[PDB]
């Protein structure tokens, strides 16, 4: 396998890890804050997916400093992973076009 393809899967594994720990930490950070809704694990994991993908429907979000910090790591991991897949798909097409040009 090629590097870019390795980094892709890697980012996918790391992202799944960030999503899991992210859901766990959000609950830990949010419980204690009156009015907080990101306080049970199942929905927190859903929240983490809509954060990593940037869809952010707005049905769930952190209201605490530490929950927001956790949110940032998740957004950055998501944006970075998905952007890394784009870059991998780009390197793949560029190589194929090189062959197709007999270069």
């Amino acid at each position, epitope marked *: 396998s090629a590097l870019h393809w390795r980094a892709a899967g890697a980012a996918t594994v790391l992202l799944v890890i960030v999503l899991l720990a992210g859901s766990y930490l959000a609950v830990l950070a949010e*419980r204690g804050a009156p009015g907080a*809704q990101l*306080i*049970t694990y*199942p929905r927190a994991l859903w929240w983490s997916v809509e954060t990593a993908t940037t869809v952010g429907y707005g049905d769930l979000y952190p209201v605490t400093l530490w929950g927001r910090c956790v949110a940032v790591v998740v957004m950055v991991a998501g944006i970075t992973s998905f952007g890394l897949v784009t870059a991998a798909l780009a390197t793949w097409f560029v190589g194929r076009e090189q062959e197709r040009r007999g270069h």
Partner: antibody
Amino acid sequence: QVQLQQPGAELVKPGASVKLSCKASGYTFTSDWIHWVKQRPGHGLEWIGEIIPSYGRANYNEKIQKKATLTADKSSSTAFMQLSSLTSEDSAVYYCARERGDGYFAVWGAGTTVTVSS
Amino acid sequence: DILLTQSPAILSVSPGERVSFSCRASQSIGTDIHWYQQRTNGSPRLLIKYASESISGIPSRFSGSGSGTDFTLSINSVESEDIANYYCQQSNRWPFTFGSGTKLEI
């Protein structure tokens, strides 16, 4: 088998303090939270606070005066609630309950009857 | 902090009839409401979770419905063993809260 084991009772002198225990068993997940609920005779249930043993973090009901302190012992699977400077208003049954981090109390202890008296 | 109102406080029904306990939330809480039964001297027991999901070991006679701010716990054909206090509890927003409870009287 009984999943939460609590001592049947505790007598306490006004001003003194007591440390209630709650030994757990059955399935345990680092994601579990142990809650404490207070029920004065003839009254309803009142949430006191919660703790997650795997991290030792604890949260308390803000609406009521804080007379509790939660700690836990990961090795013996035991949750502790330290009640301090008690008065007759603190006389009641104190239950502990396990929550899998999904919002509801699947299991409860039999409760500890605490009496504040000389 | 979400306020849960359980009214009436006492409910009287004849044997075998269908009974309904009410629970209203001060704000919208989806379906994050749970029901417990507490008999005299006993400890609370989970009956229904998330407004309508049944718990194993609980008679099929118990059901729940509702969403938003209004919720109902029903018992099809009540019987002596159902005599007890019933509480609701929300987990939508921190901190979790309980209703004042409703006594069933036959």
